[PDB]
Write a protein that binds this ligand. Structure first.
Ligand SMILES: O=c1ccn([C@H]2C[C@H](O)[C@@H](COP(=O)(O)O)O2)c(=O)[nH]1
Lengths: 118, 137
């Protein structure tokens, strides 16, 4: 099964978006787009959390189905976060794995980037 | 090979914190996840602003210079995956549904900054149906 990071690679290739094989310093325009998309989706997460909190405050008993907009927005946020890493040429899974290693047990992301060049 | 969502599950088992099926959370837990999302987002925002300033000064960035951004981005994945896992929601099921509906945008126009937009007749992911599938075994 494809990982979510590999899925981003498929998406960018299907839309004609830069998706380099190895870590690649980016043009400013790429950085600016990635910041915009991250701001867009994290605002949507925030708004969907605010709706849940407001309903709960008024006594509503949330159902599982009631979580679908927030889950959708959280997945959208994953999507643009992975997307930033993909457009930088950086294997997100390799960086996530090193972060996970440190949390589970210090993350050397600089070392992962260096290794990804080769 | 474990996915990143499954790694978050492992991490939550290791620290003593999560449901198997979608479960409405207590409000305090929501406020907590928002706080964690807000802290890692701000790190990402400042690091990109950091790199943008260096380029505006004329610096040619190297791949090595990308490590704090890559680190901040992975921390953001971690707490975003963590949010879905504490909700009892399988991130990979949701993501696969979001992904299929993003692939279907390929023929749409593009915004000036490069954002892919939706073509005529596009239809969104049915994340409600994913939740119901997850809720009902
Ligand atoms: O250039 C783009 C345009 C869209 N998306 C994905 C992120 C979200 O999953 C979703 C957001 O699209 P909008 O609903 O905001 O148009 O599409 C990208 O990854 N890159």
């Amino acid at each position: 099964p494809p990982t979510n990071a590999e899925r981003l690679h498929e998406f960018h290739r299907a839309i004609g978006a830069a998706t380099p094989e190895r870590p690649t310093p980016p043009p400013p325009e790429l950085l600016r787009l990635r910041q915009t998309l991250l701001d867009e989706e994290s605002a949507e997460v925030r708004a969907e959390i605010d709706h849940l909190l407001a309903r709960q405050a008024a006594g509503e008993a949330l159902s599982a189905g009631d979580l679908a907009p927030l889950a959708h927005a959280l997945a959208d946020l994953l999507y643009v976060t992975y997307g930033a890493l993909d457009q930088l040429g950086i294997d997100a899974d390799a960086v996530f794995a090193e972060v996970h290693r440190a949390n589970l047990s210090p993350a050397d992301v600089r070392g992962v980037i260096e290794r990804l060049q080769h």
